[PDB]
Amino acid sequence: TKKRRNGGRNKHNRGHVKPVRCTNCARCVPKDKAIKKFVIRNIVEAAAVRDITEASIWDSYVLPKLYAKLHYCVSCAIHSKVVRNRSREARRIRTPPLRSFPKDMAR
């Protein structure tokens, strides 16, 4: 009942490597086999953007965003619908797809 080929992630000629805990579970897991979503999320959530332009001291100040690389474990991914359940064959790609729009939650 081995399904993945290599297994988790990134254990080529090392052994056992650095962990850091998940944010939404903190089951302390190694840095390779945990889902690592990285997001530049915006501050006003794209709704108060029209309000701060009126209340700005300067010409729109133009708004920055936040940067922080968050770290998720496996059930954290599935209990928030992050990445889930391809086929026995459709687990064999990493690099594609999005194909449609500039992805939200940034935004």
Q: Are the CB atoms for 39 and 80 separated by under 8 Å?
A: no
Q: Does position 103 bind RNA by CB under 7 A?
A: no
The terminus-to-terminus CA distance of the chain in angstroms comes to 40
DSSP state for residue 6 in the 8-state scheme: S
Q: Which positions from 8 through 37 interact with RNA, judged by CB under 7 A?
A: 11-13, 15-16
Q: Does position 78 bind RNA by CB under 7 A?
A: yes
| Candidate ranges 7-15, 33-41, 43-51, 57-65; the one touching RNA (CB under 7 A) | 7-15
| Candidate ranges 47-55, 60-68, 81-89, 96-104; the one touching RNA (CB under 7 A) | 81-89
CA-angle at 78, arms to 74 and 79, nearest 5°: 110
In the chain, the amino acid numbered 46 is A
Considering only residues 50, 69, 81, 103, which one is a binding residue for RNA as defined by CB under 7 A?
81
Q: What is the contact surface with RNA in residues (CB under 7 A)? A: 1-3, 5-7, 11-13, 15-16, 78, 81, 84-85, 88-89, 92
